[PDB]
Design a protein around this ligand. Structure first.
Ligand SMILES: CC(=O)N[C@@H]1[C@@H](O[C@@H]2O[C@H](CO)[C@H](O)[C@H](O[C@H]3O[C@H](CO)[C@H](O)[C@H](O)[C@H]3NC(C)=O)[C@H]2O[C@@H]2O[C@@H](C)[C@@H](O)[C@@H](O)[C@@H]2O)[C@H](O)[C@@H](CO)O[C@H]1O
Length: 586
């Protein structure tokens, strides 16, 4: 084992920072990224506390599809990264980089990445100590003949150099099962046997209309727990709104895949935080997003989605490391062995812990994420772990998994009901994590959570998450309901069929819209109400360390009822928010 170039784990999570090559400007002899970010500019604008946990991920996007184009662009940017001088300290501080090396099956008709040899990758690793890994993404829809063999070479060259191979894929057409050898392409499976400590496997929730969110995330978690991958994570994609044909928030009707560039802007900002919670809460530690212009920003500036949601969320996972593999293993009651492709894919978890086939969210935390691995793999390294002796390892073909009803009946026996209300909630140690799980329906949700004898009731509008921690002197609260108004994108269309016929915004049009109407002149959403009720309280609580998105919240209003030892807290806000309530129990 060569020394790892970086740590990636619960204590050192990783936020990938995508920069997509502008192929049009490359043809004009320029080296630039879509959205106007520069490599040096981007890196400099990353907050210093985040810098040890973030890596620039270069992506060849629409570079010309011929030999030499991607190598020329990548070499140019690796040189910039390597030679970066910190202006405050005057010191050369090489920018850490990941290269996107495989995508769209590396088909020569789809990507310039085709012309990136493993031999050249080896050369770059040896030349650039700041090259920390390489990335393969989204081939589930074009599962090339040698994809597994090539994946094996990518992992081996990374391990050889102490770097990471990162593969973001979704279980469409059995992709994940096939990756590990289902159809007899076993090269990557053998590679993983040797080199799993240099593998990161992530979901990629883009193909949302196929509904494989829950199954893929279950695999990613189970692959990790069984030592088939070093860590896991997810790439969360606002293009899901396009894939499922949604348009104006809460509006009636489906427009199909007809307005791509309006559609990838419309997903509520706080919903990305809700998706990310599924990663964190289950021991995942790698985060990445599309569309980059919305999720991260443009022109070396942070989008509000980035600054108010993603940055703050990621700062949370650094301050409070995800549950360790050991910890997640201890709490795992059921581990599924077999192929979701033979059991209805996403349908498996519908009305078990998801409210519909096409959602990246959960409706209950009761089972958290049930981990699984594909049938082709073996549970040997799982059972070898000491913390895994109390887990029921079950074939997916077991009668307990035969129907929706059977699954719930079986799981309910092993995962006790631990809160009340139709709302998502999951508990870790002294912390309740809660969100409203509605995707595009304007419906409030309520729940009743307990910290021993202390009772906490909440009322959440859609696209709201909260983290409530019982501290010795009271309760720490993090709340996020940040959702700006995207209605202007859907102007001039009163219904679905008119929305379909809107002039295309286009890629360049959406980038300009971000610059002109999101980065500045932002149309903020209305403040909306969140209610928190505490029962079992001695006196009116005091509020401390209150902060949030600038100009986004009214002062929290507290109403103490002495006779009933209870407080009702009314919050009216639209943004990130944090405070502590100090109180004693009655
Ligand atoms: C699998 C799927 O749902 N769509 C395939 C494409 O893969 C991604 O799909 C998105 C639509 O859901 C969208 O087209 C993505 O590409 C646009 O957005 C990215 C940044 O988010 C870039 O700006 C792209 O240039 C732009 N593409 C356009 C305008 O066509 C697309 O993601 C990209 O491609 C995949 C393979 C992967 O490399 C991603 O990292 C990358 O962002 C797929 O690209 C398309 C090719 O014909 O086919 C769809 O089936």
């Amino acid at each position: 084992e060569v020394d790892k170039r970086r740590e990636i784990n619960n204590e050192h999570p990783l936020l990938m920072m995508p920069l997509y090559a502008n192929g049009e400007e490359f043809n004009q002899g320029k080296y630039t990224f879509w959205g106007g970010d520069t490599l040096t500019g981007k890196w400099e604008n990353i907050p210093d506390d985040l810098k040890p946990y973030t890596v620039i991920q270069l992506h060849p996007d629409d570079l010309p599809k011929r030999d030499g184009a991607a190598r020329d662009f990548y070499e140019h940017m690796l040189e910039e990264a390597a030679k970066y001088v910190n202006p405050k300290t005057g010191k050369n501080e090489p920018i850490p980089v990941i290269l996107t090396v495989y995508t769209a099956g590396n088909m020569p008709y789809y990507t310039s990445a085709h012309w990136l040899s493993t031999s050249w990758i080896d050369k770059m690793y040896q030349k650039y100590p700041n090259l920390h890994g390489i990335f393969s993404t989204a081939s589930y829809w074009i599962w090339a003949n040698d994809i597994e063999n090539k994946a094996a070479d990518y992992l081996k060259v990374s391990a050889k150099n102490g770097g990471y191979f990162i593969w973001a894929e979704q279980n469409v057409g059995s992709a994940i099962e096939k990756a590990f050898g289902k159809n007899g392409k076993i090269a990557f499976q053998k590679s993983v046997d040797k080199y799993w400590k240099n593998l990161i496997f992530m979901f990629k929730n883009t193909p949302a209309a196929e509904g494989n969110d829950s199954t893929t995330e279950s695999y990613m978690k189970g692959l990790w727990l069984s030592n088939h991958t070093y860590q896991w994570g997810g790439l969360m994609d606002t293009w899901k709104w396009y894939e499922t044909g949604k348009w104006k928030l809460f509006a009636s009707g489906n427009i199909g895949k007809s307005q791509g560039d309006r559609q990838w802007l419309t997903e509520p900002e706080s919903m990305l935080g809700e998706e990310a919670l599924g990663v964190y809460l289950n021991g995942g530690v790698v985060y990445n997003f599309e569309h980059p212009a919305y999720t991260y920003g443009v022109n070396n500036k942070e989008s509000l989605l980035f600054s108010e949601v993603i940055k703050e969320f990621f700062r949370y996972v650094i301050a409070h490391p995800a549950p360790s593999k050991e910890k997640v293993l201890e709490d795992t009651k059921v581990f599924i062995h077999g192929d979701y492709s033979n059991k209805g894919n996403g349908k498996f978890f519908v009305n078990v812990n998801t409210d519909r086939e096409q959602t990246p969210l959960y409706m209950t935390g009761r089972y958290n994420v049930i981990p699984a691995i594909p049938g082709v793999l073996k549970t040997d390294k799982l059972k070898e772990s000491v913390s895994s002796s109390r887990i029921q390892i079950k074939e997916i073909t077991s009668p307990e998994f035969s129907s929706t009803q059977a699954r719930k009946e079986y799981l309910n026996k092993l995962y006790p009901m631990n809160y009340e209300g139709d709302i998502f909630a999951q508990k870790l140690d002294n912390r309740w994590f809660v969100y409203n799980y509605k995707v595009n329906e304007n419906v409030k949700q309520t729940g009743k959570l307990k910290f021993n004898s202390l009772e906490m009731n909440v009322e959440f509008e859609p696209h709201t998450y909260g983290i409530f921690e019982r501290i010795s002197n009271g309760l720490k609260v993090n709340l996020n309901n940040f959702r700006t108004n995207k209605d202007s994108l859907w102007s001039n269309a009163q219904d679905a069929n008119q929305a379909k016929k809107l002039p295309q915004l286009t890629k360049k049009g959406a980038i300009k819209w971000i610059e002109e109407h999101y980065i500045k002149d932002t149309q903020f959403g209305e403040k909306r109400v969140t209610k928190i009720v505490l029962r079992g309280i001695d006196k009116l609580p005091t509020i401390h360390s209150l902060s949030g998105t600038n100009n986004s919240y009214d002062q929290p209003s507290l109403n103490f009822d002495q006779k009933n030892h209870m407080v009702t807290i009314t919050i009216n806000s639209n943004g990130n928010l944090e405070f502590e309530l100090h109180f004693l129990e009655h």
